RNA sequence: CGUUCUUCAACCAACGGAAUAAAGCUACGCUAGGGAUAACAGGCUUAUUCGCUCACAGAGUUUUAUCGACGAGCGCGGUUGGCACCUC
RNA sequence: CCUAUGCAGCUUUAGGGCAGGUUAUUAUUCAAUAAACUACCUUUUUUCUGGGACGGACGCUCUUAUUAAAGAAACAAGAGUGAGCAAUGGUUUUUACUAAUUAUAAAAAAGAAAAGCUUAACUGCAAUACAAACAAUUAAAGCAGGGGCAUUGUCGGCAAUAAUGCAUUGAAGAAAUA
RNA sequence: UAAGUCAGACGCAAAGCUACAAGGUUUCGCGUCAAAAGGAAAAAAGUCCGCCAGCGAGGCUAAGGUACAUAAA
RNA sequence: AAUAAAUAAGUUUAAUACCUUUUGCAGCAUGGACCAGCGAUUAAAUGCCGGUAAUUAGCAAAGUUAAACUAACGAAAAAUA
């Protein structure tokens, strides 16, 4: 009788000259209307995301067969295309997290603090429990 | 966008710009608009001067004892306490509370706008220089209670606030500035004995 | 809520049960005090209307109009208000006419502090 | 992410494993992991009813670490206000601290250039020296090291305090590490009344077999102190220290090499090592050489007698480096940002005393500044004129004459600005 | 847990630290043979009966049923 | 707490893991033990037992035992007997030359250790020590505690 | 006997699904409420109904005597409807 | 007349029970058990809705009007779906090819078909974002291990937008305790 | 504020449903009422001007008015 | 809605009770004939969040209960010698 499907927000998220950080989504589209340019990626559903720190750019290209192609680019901070820019981006990522924690305040906790320790698997932290809970380092050999 | 939750986009963008500025220094170091910014001024036009006005009221002495008054044949218009009055000797007027005067004191009123008799009239534009009116302070009183009441039907709203205004009473003694018409002169003593206590 | 003493003090001049019956008098007291707030506001409008009527009647006896007088006073820098002008027309006809003649014809003799400069 | 609301950074596994544990001590970890002065203040405010002397000692020590992060500038307002509040707790618990806790307290407050009130400082000293220092025996090496340097920086010069402390520590000197002994030697040199006491000789003798374990920074300071303390080299430390420097000349950082080089020159032991000394300076001149060390390099090279060479104009680059530090100009290049060059830390006003010393040293170098269009000393004096123009109030009759002598010596006496 | 729901739980006095409670019988040297009880499996089914169930899981109290007679 | 009928709080799974019994022990840090000795509330020249810790005020109320944990830099030997210990504490004490012993006590034995006067004032013999512990606890204890501890010099 | 990990199944399609399961009559009816909501009357609307004008095609056959249409516009509140504004 | 945390009486091949009689089986010299028949006891019998009943509907996708940011309702309108594929997945080579889907101006260094080898339709983790009352739902750089095709690139299923179901209870494989 | 609210109404301007009807119904942009006294249009919730702490026989204006009713050519 | 604001005392102008309930009530929606007396978020235990103090609390009387605290990276070198 009635009914409606859940809405999908297709469209751009940033304009020309806006600053982005790695992992941020720039475009949500149902078809490949826009193609990935430099310093960007594309998901299996045609989601375009940034892969470095920089500013968003838009450009148009005319192909060999007379079709129009549209790209999305991310430009480095000072137009630095050298391979040394990657380490600068890594430092900026660490700094950005510190800025956010300072603004939010101490009472917005960003790590858990339980009365027990989480198990370790394959050298990383795991959220799955072991069959038995034991204190670390409270037993000797044999 | 459909959600009513407030957006955090401005917070996410500020954290990105702050991080870059903290680590990467800028190339420019000056701004011309700041370099030539001039001193702060009050305005860009000359100030408008004010128009002088005569003094409102001033004490000149005190009254020693009981007196009597007779009727005269002159009148005038005087501005006092924000309103105008038409006065002749032996009149009583009620005004707002006047500060700095006491009962049984004589005051001088200088904002005279009109003087008249039975043979001549003098018109001020807007004030007459060299004219004055004398009066005696008789009372500083609280007037009758005024009951202030407010209510809104069906809204559970009701307010009651009684009040008592403050006022002053004066009796006119003499009007100076215009001569009576011929044959209208008062040829006998008229007013009280005043002890002058204001010499400038 | 007003007390019995306050209610009966206000209602001492009311008619019938409105004088000595609390429930009847209380509603009559509150409605009357509401009338008084409106009454004080309207008083200032009515009195100014009466002043203008008296001034206009005096002006037209000489062949003038109220609106012409108000404009003429502002050109001469005369700042007499309507309460005073109303009283002059009723009680001081000669002075009221002198004001009209100055505004219309401007034939008054000027006065200086030094009569002989 | 997925765990927290929008804008909240995700957890750090390293921090998460510290806080999630079966053992107590939550408050201590919270203050130890604080990343800013404001964050630490909030932790103390919300835990006021449960603070103890151990918490206060750690809080004052954290001020040392926060200051280190915020380098390139003086102590900020939030740090100063936080230090003031901590002092009230020190007075409250002044009678409950242990020797170790007092040692941490003084070190943290000294690193922030905070002067403890004389009445409170006396109380803290009394705790350490009470019972003739018999409680000092139950302390580790680090506690003793921080006691000596912490109080010395504060300026406590009570003879009885130092006499008792020296007596108790004396038997343990042979068993301390090289760095700990070096710190003790520095304090002895600064305290005149201990210059010729047996304690000074005992310290020098104890350091003889531990020279090889000294760190580059402690090694440089030990050589400086030993030169003033034992000019006769009776203990042999100077001989051993010089031998190690010669063997490991290029194995130390620039700052330590400059300090040791200057000490050798003033000791009149100069040898034909200038060629080896010049190359490291030019190789690393934009970094590892602040204003103070730049002056030290000039004095050592000038005293040694090295002369400007066409291949390596060391004096010319030093003038540019000095001008850069005075002006404070920064660079946005990626290499400079990643290299953490000192010149990009910002602008820091320098004392006029250093400016006069640098100007005199450049004048004594013997190079011209004005006459030539591009002279080695041109950039320094041009920057000096600009800097002085903004601080004329600090110029007096003596300072103006001192610069005028330097300006005439270099060859600028026409009353005109430097070409550059 | 969402902030609005968490505050209500804390306001009511929720302070649990572990998923379950420790067993004092497992501490060495403190085993009491008299107070022996085989370990049981915790029940995960909430009591949702609106007549004798949890007042926080029903909107209002319902009348009780009749007894067999 | 009613949410209108959605009942969102009971849409989450249930966990049944049993926590370790050692959460019933009193925890004592090595850094706190040293502070008491430095202030003079504990005698470091003789063996330290849980009775001394209780009287000194390090431990508030004991029902099962004391767990020693943490890292500390020591300069003098310490000999301490506790019921449980981690590896960080053992290394710290042994580095200075001390000895850490894990002692096994029963319910009745622990009472005699802490309050011997409670038995002598009533002219009662002290509780007797245990013979051995269950093999399931091998690797948890080093020796069987004696109700009157044997103090030694350090 | 209990716990953890890797996984699946049934009724939940009234598809945020739980009191394990599970149909009707009351004109013999009872209580608590609503004009927040129907049946009669009033109100708004005028599709429909009715009337008038333009239109003069077509029948009568010189006549717009009389009858009378496609189509368009306007009016009425009396026909069949729509809404739920007043009163439970 | 409609609306309730509704009440009561009556009815039955609506659910459950056996507590009188009859009947069936078994046992001692007025008894015990019950998917039967009669009697009796107790419990259930949605909501939306241009009033209610009758009829219809309830999950999830695509498209139309409210213009060319997003979002936006009615028992408004026009169409799909509760799957399929051991290759129709992954990856290399060749070229007289450039389609089709429920619907649709996707796409040329891309696809489809043909030929060859394969199982990444993995194990353990994850910065940062889209969306969003919450629950859940969506995209994803990167790190370690073992692999596939290439020979230094890609693979954590399928052009994309639908093919689904919380917790509880039950069951299976393995591992750790007791 | 771990509060109250989850019955909304009309004017101008658009679209769906109805009959390019309804003081109809469903969305959407602005305003007013709701919770707003005072002035103008006849009475005047939603239109036009304009937001009331109190008193006064001072003055200037808005919308709207200026042969009588009824202030002002 | 029986009053209000004024007045030369002749009169003139302004002015559809209250409560409850509602998108909206002078309401042809609800309740009250009038007066006096009576008549409705109270107490206990526990938890959460502010304010004001004590500077651990209770017993006992040199010894015991309750609570609270208990390792995080030992990182500073400011010597015009
Ligand atoms: K349902
Ligand atoms: K009715
Ligand atoms: K209807
Ligand atoms: K009566
Ligand atoms: Mg359907
Ligand atoms: Mg009824
Ligand atoms: Mg209705
Ligand atoms: Mg309606
Ligand atoms: Mg219904
Ligand atoms: Mg969420
Ligand atoms: Mg590979
Ligand atoms: Mg793929
Ligand atoms: Mg509702
Ligand atoms: Mg609603
Ligand atoms: Mg409507
Ligand atoms: Mg309302
Ligand atoms: Mg005017
Ligand atoms: Mg008139
Ligand atoms: Mg209604
Ligand atoms: Mg009645």
| Beta carbons of A118 and D53 less than 8 angstroms apart | no
| Beta carbons of A77 and B16 less than 8 angstroms apart | no
DSSP code of residue A82: S
Please tell me the distance from the alpha carbon of residue C12 to that of residue C25, in angstroms, as a whole number. 10
Strand nucleotide closest to residue F88 (CA to C1'): J71
Q: Would the Cβ of B163 be found within 7 angstroms of any atom in strand I?
A: yes
Provide DSSP, A96-138. HHHHHHHHH-TTS--S---SSPPPEETTEE-SSPPSS---TT-
DSSP code of residue A9: -
| Beta carbons of D238 and D226 less than 8 angstroms apart | yes
**What are the tokens at B33?**
């608009």
Please tell me the distance from the alpha carbon of residue D55 to that of residue D32, in angstroms, as a whole number. 10
Which of left, alpha, beta for C77 (phi over 0: left; psi -120 to 50: alpha)? Answer: left
DSSP code of residue C111: -
Strand nucleotide closest to residue D180 (CA to C1'): J74
* Burial classification of residue B183, based on how many CB atoms lie within 10 Å of its CB (0-12 exposed, 13-18 middle, 19 or more buried): exposed
Contact F20 A133 (CB under 8 A): yes
**Rg of the Cα atoms in chain C:** 25
Centroid of chain to Cα C11: 30
DSSP code of residue A67: -
Q: Which nucleotides of H are covered by protein (CB under 7 A)?
A: 5, 7, 19, 41-43, 56-63, 69-77, 104, 106-109, 124-141, 144, 157-161, 166-169, 175-178
Q: Which of B8, B25, B26 is closest, CB to CB, to D7?
A: B8
3-state secondary structure D328-353: CCCCCCHHHHHHCCHHHHCCCCCCHH
Selection from A67, A66, A86, A90 nearest residue A76 by Cα: A86
Q: Which of D6, D7, D332 is closest, CB to CB, to B25?
A: D332
* Phi, psi (degrees; rounded to nearest 5) at B179: -80, 145
DSSP code of residue A60: E
For D124, D184, E4, the CA distances from E7, given in Å and listed in that order, are 45, 56, 6
* Phi, psi (degrees; rounded to nearest 5) at B38: -85, 175
**What are the tokens at E30?**
């403190």
Q: Which of A116, A133, A140 is closest, CB to CB, to F139?
A: A140
- Find the helix or strand (DSSP H, E) in which C7 lies: helix C4-10
**What are the tokens at F72?**
């500390």
| Beta carbons of D37 and D65 less than 8 angstroms apart | no
Alpha-carbon distance D331 to nearest alpha carbon in chain B (angstroms) = 7
| Beta carbons of F147 and F49 less than 8 angstroms apart | no
Contact A137 F87 (CB under 8 A): yes
3-state secondary structure B2-50: CCCCCCCHHHHHHHHHHHHHHHCCCCCCCCHHHHCCCCCCCCCCCCCCC
For residue A75, whether the previous peptide bond is cis, meaning omega lies within 30 degrees of 0, is: no
Please tell me the distance from the alpha carbon of residue D384 to that of residue D363, in angstroms, as a whole number. 14
Please tell me the distance from the alpha carbon of residue D358 to that of residue D292, in angstroms, as a whole number. 10
Q: How many CB atoms lie within 10 A of CB B126?
A: 17
Selection from D330, D300, D328 nearest residue D314 by Cα: D300
For A112, A126, B27, B93, the CA distances from D16, given in Å and listed in that order, are 6, 12, 40, 87
- Please enumerate, as own/partner, the contacts of A108-114 that have beta carbons within 8 Å and a separation of 24 or more: A108/D8, A110/D4, A110/D8, A110/D9, A110/D10, A110/D11, A110/D12, A111/D11, A111/D12, A111/D15, A111/D16, A111/D19, A112/D11, A112/D16, A112/D19, A112/D20, A113/D19, A113/D20, A113/D26, A114/D20, A114/E17
Q: How many CB atoms lie within 10 A of CB B48?
A: 6
Alpha-carbon distance E49 to nearest alpha carbon in chain F (angstroms) = 13
Q: Strand G footprint at Cβ < 7 Å?
A: A 128-132; E 38-42, 48-51, 62, 65; F 6-8, 10-11, 15-18
Q: Which of B84, B123, B129 is closest, CB to CB, to C108?
A: B123
C6-42 burial: b if 16+ Cβ within 10 Å, else e: ebbebbeebeeeeeeeeebbbebbbeebeeeeeeeee
Which of left, alpha, beta for D179 (phi over 0: left; psi -120 to 50: alpha)? Answer: alpha
| Beta carbons of B166 and B97 less than 8 angstroms apart | yes
Please tell me the distance from the alpha carbon of residue B55 to that of residue A116, in angstroms, as a whole number. 87
Q: How many CB atoms lie within 10 A of CB B94?
A: 13
Q: Which of B2, B17, B22 is closest, CB to CB, to A19?
A: B17
CA atoms within 13 A on the CB side of C58: 24
Which of left, alpha, beta for D328 (phi over 0: left; psi -120 to 50: alpha)? Answer: left
Centroid of chain to Cα E35: 22
**What are the tokens at A48?**
């375009």
Ligand positioned closest to the Cα atom of F4: 13
Chains in touch with A (≥3 Cβ pairs < 8 A): B, D, E, F
Please tell me the distance from the alpha carbon of residue E15 to that of residue D417, in angstroms, as a whole number. 76
3-state secondary structure chain D: CCCCCCCCCCCCHHHHHHHCCCCCCHHHHHHHCCCCHHHHHHHHHHCHHHCCHHHHHHHHHHHHHHHHHCCCCCCCHHHHHHHHHHHHHHHHCCCCCCHHHHHHHHHHHHHCCCCCCHHHHHHHHHHHHHHHHHHHHCCCHHHHHHHHHHHHHHCCCCHHHHHHHHHHHHHHHHHCCHHHHHHHHHHHHHCHHHCCCHHHHHHHHHHHHHHHHCCHHHHHHHHHHHHHHCCCCCCCHHHHHHHHHHHCHHHCCHHHHHHHHHHHHHCCCCCCCHHHHHHHHHHCCCCCCCHHHHHHHHHHHHHHCCCCCCCCCHHHHHHHHHHHHHHCCCCCCHHHHHHCCHHHHCCCCCCHHHHHHHHHHHHHHCCCCCCCCCCCCHHHHHHHHHHHHCCHHHCCHHHHHHHHHHHHHHCCCCCCCCCC
Please tell me the distance from the alpha carbon of residue B61 to that of residue F9, in angstroms, as a whole number. 89
Please tell me the distance from the alpha carbon of residue F64 to that of residue A88, in angstroms, as a whole number. 56
**What are the tokens at A100?**
């956010």
Q: How many CB atoms lie within 10 A of CB C69?
A: 19
Please tell me the distance from the alpha carbon of residue C37 to that of residue B162, in angstroms, as a whole number. 12
Alpha-carbon distance E65 to nearest alpha carbon in chain F (angstroms) = 23
Please tell me the distance from the alpha carbon of residue E63 to that of residue E52, in angstroms, as a whole number. 9
| Beta carbons of B154 and B132 less than 8 angstroms apart | no
DSSP code of residue C98: H
Which of left, alpha, beta for B105 (phi over 0: left; psi -120 to 50: alpha)? Answer: beta
Q: Which nucleotides of I are covered by protein (CB under 7 A)?
A: 2, 35-36, 53-60, 71-73
D81-113 burial: b if 16+ Cβ within 10 Å, else e: ebbeebbebbeebbeebbbbbbbbbbbbbbbbe
Q: How many CB atoms lie within 10 A of CB D325?
A: 22
Strand nucleotide closest to residue F59 (CA to C1'): J70
Contact D22 F23 (CB under 8 A): yes
Q: State the distance from the centre of ligand 17 to the C-alpha of C75, rounded, in angstroms.
A: 14
- Find the helix or strand (DSSP H, E) in which A94 lies: helix A85-104
Residues of B in contact with D6 (CB under 8 A): 8, 12
Please tell me the distance from the alpha carbon of residue D384 to that of residue D359, in angstroms, as a whole number. 9
Q: State the distance from the centre of ligand 3 to the C-alpha of A4, rounded, in angstroms.
A: 27
* Burial classification of residue D59, based on how many CB atoms lie within 10 Å of its CB (0-12 exposed, 13-18 middle, 19 or more buried): buried
Alpha-carbon distance E47 to nearest alpha carbon in chain F (angstroms) = 11
DSSP code of residue C57: H
Please tell me the distance from the alpha carbon of residue D342 to that of residue D336, in angstroms, as a whole number. 9
Please tell me the distance from the alpha carbon of residue F29 to that of residue F68, in angstroms, as a whole number. 6
Please tell me the distance from the alpha carbon of residue D419 to that of residue D370, in angstroms, as a whole number. 7
Strand nucleotide closest to residue B84 (CA to C1'): I58
Please tell me the distance from the alpha carbon of residue D76 to that of residue D67, in angstroms, as a whole number. 9
Centroid of chain to Cα D354: 16
Provide DSSP, chain B. --S-SPP-HHHHHHHHHHHHHHHS--S----HHHHT-----S-SSPPPPPPP----EEEEEEE-S-------S-EEEEEETTEEEEE-TT-EEEEEPPSS--TTEEEEE--EEEEE-SS-EEE-SS--TT-EEEEEEEEEEE---B--EEEETTTTEEEE--B--EEEEEEEEEEESSPPPTT----S--S--EEE----
* Phi, psi (degrees; rounded to nearest 5) at B137: -80, 120
Q: Tally the residues of chain A.
A: 142
Please tell me the distance from the alpha carbon of residue A73 to that of residue A57, in angstroms, as a whole number. 5
Contact B25 D344 (CB under 8 A): yes
Please tell me the distance from the alpha carbon of residue B78 to that of residue B172, in angstroms, as a whole number. 11
Alpha-carbon distance A127 to nearest alpha carbon in chain F (angstroms) = 13
- Find the helix or strand (DSSP H, E) in which C91 lies: helix C82-91
Centroid of chain to Cα F31: 15
* Phi, psi (degrees; rounded to nearest 5) at B41: -120, 160
- Please enumerate, as own/partner, the contacts of C33-39 that have beta carbons within 8 Å and a separation of 24 or more: C33/B147, C33/B149, C34/B149, C34/B150, C34/B151, C36/B147, C36/B149, C37/B148, C37/B149, C37/B150
Preferred mutation among A109, A133, A138 to probe E, highest tally of E CBs within 10 A: A133
Ligand positioned closest to the Cα atom of F5: 1
Q: How many CB atoms lie within 10 A of CB E29?
A: 20
CA atoms within 13 A on the CB side of B153: 4
Chains in touch with B (≥3 Cβ pairs < 8 A): A, C, D
| Beta carbons of D420 and D375 less than 8 angstroms apart | no
Residues of chain D in Cβ contact (below 8 Å) with chain B? 6-7, 330-332, 337, 344
Preferred mutation among D5, D14, D22 to probe A, highest tally of A CBs within 10 A: D22
The three-state secondary structure class of E21 is: coil
Please tell me the distance from the alpha carbon of residue B158 to that of residue B151, in angstroms, as a whole number. 5
Contacts of residue C104, defined as CB under 8 A and 6 or more positions apart, other chains included, come to C64, C72
- Please enumerate, as own/partner, the contacts of C45-50 that have beta carbons within 8 Å and a separation of 24 or more: C48/C82, C50/C86
**Rg of the Cα atoms in chain F:** 20
**Beta strands B149-152 and B105-109, pairing class:** unpaired
Provide DSSP, A13-48. S--TT-EE-TT-EEEE-SS-SSEE-TTEEE-TTS-E
Place of tokens 């062949």: C63
Q: How many CB atoms lie within 10 A of CB E7?
A: 11
Q: How was this structure determined?
A: cryo-EM
| Beta carbons of D36 and D66 less than 8 angstroms apart | yes
Q: Which of E23, E41, E44 is closest, CB to CB, to F21?
A: E23
CB proximity F74 to D under 8 Å = yes
Residue B163 bridge partners (DSSP): B146
Question: In this structure, is the dihedral angle defined by the CA atoms of residues C26, C28, C33 and C37, taken in order, positive or negative?
Answer: positive
Provide DSSP, chain F. ---SS--GGGSS----PPPPGGGGSEEEEHHHHHHHHHHTSS-TTB-B-HHHHHHHTS-S--SS-EEEE-----SS--EEEESEE-HHHHHHHHHHT-EEEEEE--HHHHHHHH-THHHHTTT-PPPPPPS---GGGTTT-SEEPPSS----B-
**Beta strands A48-50 and A25-28, pairing class:** antiparallel
**What are the tokens at F110?**
């622990």
| Beta carbons of F102 and F140 less than 8 angstroms apart | yes
Q: How many CB atoms lie within 10 A of CB B172?
A: 23
| Beta carbons of D62 and D108 less than 8 angstroms apart | yes
Distance from the first to the final alpha carbon of chain D: 55
For B32, B115, C79, C110, the CA distances from C69, given in Å and listed in that order, are 60, 20, 12, 21
Please tell me the distance from the alpha carbon of residue D368 to that of residue D316, in angstroms, as a whole number. 11
CA of C39 to C1' of I63 (A): 24
């Amino acid at each position: 009788q009635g009914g409606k499907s859940h809405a999908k927000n297709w469209g751009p998220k940033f304009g020309d000259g806006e600053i982005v950080f790695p992992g941020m989504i720039i475009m949500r589209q149902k078809q490949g209307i826009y193609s990935p340019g430099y310093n960007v990626g594309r998901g299996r559903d045609y989601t375009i995301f940034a892969k470095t720190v920089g500013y968003v750019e838009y450009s148009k290209l005319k192909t060999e067969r007379g079709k129009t192609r549209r790209y999305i680019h991310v430009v480095p901070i000072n137009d630095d295309w050298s391979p040394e820019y990657q380490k600068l981006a890594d430092e900026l990522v660490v700094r950005r997290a510190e800025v956010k924690r300072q603004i939010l305040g101490h009472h917005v906790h960003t790590e858990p603090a339980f009365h027990f320790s989480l198990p370790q698997r394959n050298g990383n932290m795991s959220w799955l429990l072991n069959s038995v809970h034991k204190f670390p380092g409270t037993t000797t050999l044999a | 966008v459909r959600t009513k939750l407030p957006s955090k986009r401005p917070f996410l963008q500020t954290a990105s710009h702050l991080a870059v500025n903290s680590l990467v220094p800028s190339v420019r170091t000056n701004r011309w608009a700041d370099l030539i910014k001039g001193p702060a001024v009050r305005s860009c036009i000359p100030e408008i001067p004010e128009v002088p006005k005569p003094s409102e009221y001033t004490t000149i002495g005190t009254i020693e004892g009981p007196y009597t008054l007779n009727l005269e044949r002159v009148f005038g218009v005087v501005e006092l306490a924000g309103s105008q009055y038409k006065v002749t000797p032996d009149d009583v007027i009620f005004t707002n509370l006047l500060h700095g005067i006491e009962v049984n004191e004589v005051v001088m009123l200088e904002r005279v706008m009109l003087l008249g008799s039975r043979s001549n009239t003098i018109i001020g534009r807007p004030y007459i220089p060299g004219a004055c009116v004398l009066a005696a302070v008789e009372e500083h009183f609280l007037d009758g209670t005024v009951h202030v009441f407010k209510r809104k039907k069906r809204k559970r709203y009701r307010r009651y606030k009684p009040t008592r205004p403050m006022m002053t009473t004066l009796r006119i003694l003499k009007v100076l500035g215009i001569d009576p018409a011929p044959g209208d002169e008062l040829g006998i003593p008229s007013g009280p004995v005043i002890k002058i206590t204001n010499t400038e | 809520t007003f007390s019995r003493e306050q209610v009966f003090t206000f209602a001492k001049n009311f008619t019938g049960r409105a004088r000595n019956v609390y429930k009847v008098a209380l509603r009559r007291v509150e409605r009357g005090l509401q009338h008084s707030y409106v009454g004080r506001k309207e008083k200032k409008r009515t009195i100014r209307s009466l002043w203008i009527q008296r001034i206009n009647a005096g002006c037209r006896e000489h062949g003038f109009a109220y609106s012409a007088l108000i404009n003429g006073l502002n050109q001469e820098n005369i700042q007499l208000n309507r309460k005073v002008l109303s009283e002059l027309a009723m009680h001081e006809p000669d002075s009221f006419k002198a004001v009209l003649d100055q505004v219309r014809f401007m034939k008054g003799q000027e006065i200086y502090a030094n009569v002989e400069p | 992410g997925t765990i927290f609301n929008t804008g909240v950074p995700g957890p750090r596994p390293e921090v998460a494993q510290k806080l999630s544990t079966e053992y107590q001590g939550h408050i201590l970890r919270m203050i130890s992991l604080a990343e800013s002065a404001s964050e630490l203040d909030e932790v103390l405010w919300s835990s006021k009813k449960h603070l103890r002397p151990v918490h206060i000692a750690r809080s004052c020590l954290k001020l040392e670490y926060l200051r280190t992060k915020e380098k390139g500038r003086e102590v900020s307002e939030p740090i100063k206000n936080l230090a003031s509040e901590l002092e009230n707790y020190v007075e409250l618990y002044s009678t409950k601290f242990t020797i170790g806790q007092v040692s941490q307290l003084v070190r943290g407050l000294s690193s922030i250039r905070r002067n403890i009130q004389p009445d409170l400082l006396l109380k803290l000293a009394a705790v350490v020296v009470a019972d003739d220092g018999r409680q000092v025996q139950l302390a580790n090496e680090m506690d003793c090291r921080d006691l000596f340097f912490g109080f010395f920086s504060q300026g406590f010069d009570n003879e009885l305090f130092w006499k008792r402390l020296s007596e108790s520590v004396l038997p343990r000197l042979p068993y301390f590490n090289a760095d700990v002994v070096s710190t003790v030697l520095r304090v002895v040199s600064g305290l005149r009344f201990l210059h010729n006491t047996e304690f000074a000789h005992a310290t020098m003798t104890a350091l003889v077999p531990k020279v090889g374990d000294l760190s580059p920074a402690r090694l440089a300071d030990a050589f400086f102190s030993a030169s003033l303390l034992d000019p006769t080299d009776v203990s042999g430390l100077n001989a051993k220290l010089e031998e190690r420097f010669l063997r490991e000349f290029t194995s130390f950082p620039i700052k330590d090499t400059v300090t040791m080089f200057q000490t050798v020159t003033v000791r009149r032991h100069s040898t034909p090592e200038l060629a080896a000394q010049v190359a490291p300076l030019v190789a690393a001149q934009a970094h590892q050489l602040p204003v103070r060390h730049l002056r030290r390099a000039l004095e050592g090279m000038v005293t040694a007698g090295w002369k400007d060479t066409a291949e390596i104009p060391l004096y010319a680059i030093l003038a540019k480096q000095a001008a850069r530090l005075v002006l404070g100009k920064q660079s946005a290049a990626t290499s400079a940002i990643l290299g953490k060059h000192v010149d990009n830390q910002g602008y820091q006003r320098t004392p006029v005393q250093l400016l006069r010393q640098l100007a005199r040293i450049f004048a004594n170098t013997g190079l011209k500044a004005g006459p030539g269009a591009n002279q080695p000393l041109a950039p320094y004096f041009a920057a000096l004129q600009r800097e002085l123009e903004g601080r004329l109030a600090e110029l007096d009759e003596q300072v103006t004459d001192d610069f005028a002598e330097s300006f005439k010596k270099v060859g600028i006496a026409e009353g005109a600005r430097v070409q550059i | 847990l969402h902030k609005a729901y968490a505050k209500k739980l804390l306001k009511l006095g929720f302070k649990r630290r572990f998923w379950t409670d420790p067993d004092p019988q497992m501490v060495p040297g403190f085993f009491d043979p008299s107070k022996y009880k085989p370990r049981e499996r915790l029940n995960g089914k909430p009591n949702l009966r609106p007549d004798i169930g949890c007042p926080a899981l029903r909107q209002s109290q319902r009348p009780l049923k009749k007894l067999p007679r | 707490l009613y949410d209108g009928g959605q009942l969102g709080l009971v849409k989450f799974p249930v966990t049944r893991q049993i926590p370790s019994y050692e959460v019933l022990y009193n925890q004592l840090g090595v850094s706190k033990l040293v502070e008491f000795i430095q202030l003079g509330l504990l005698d470091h020249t003789k063996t330290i037992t849980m009775k001394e810790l209780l009287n000194a005020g390090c431990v508030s109320s004991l029902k099962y035992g004391v767990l020693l944990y943490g890292n500390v830099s020591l300069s003098f030997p310490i000999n301490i007997e506790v019921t449980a210990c981690d590896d960080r504490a053992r290394r710290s004490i042994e580095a200075a030359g001390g000895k850490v012993t894990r002692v096994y006590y029963t319910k009745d034995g622990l009472e005699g250790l802490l309050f011997p006067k409670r038995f002598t004032d009533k002219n009662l013999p002290l509780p007797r020590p245990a013979v051995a512990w269950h093999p399931k606890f091998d690797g948890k204890f080093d020796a069987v505690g004696q109700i009157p501890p044997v103090y030694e010099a350090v």
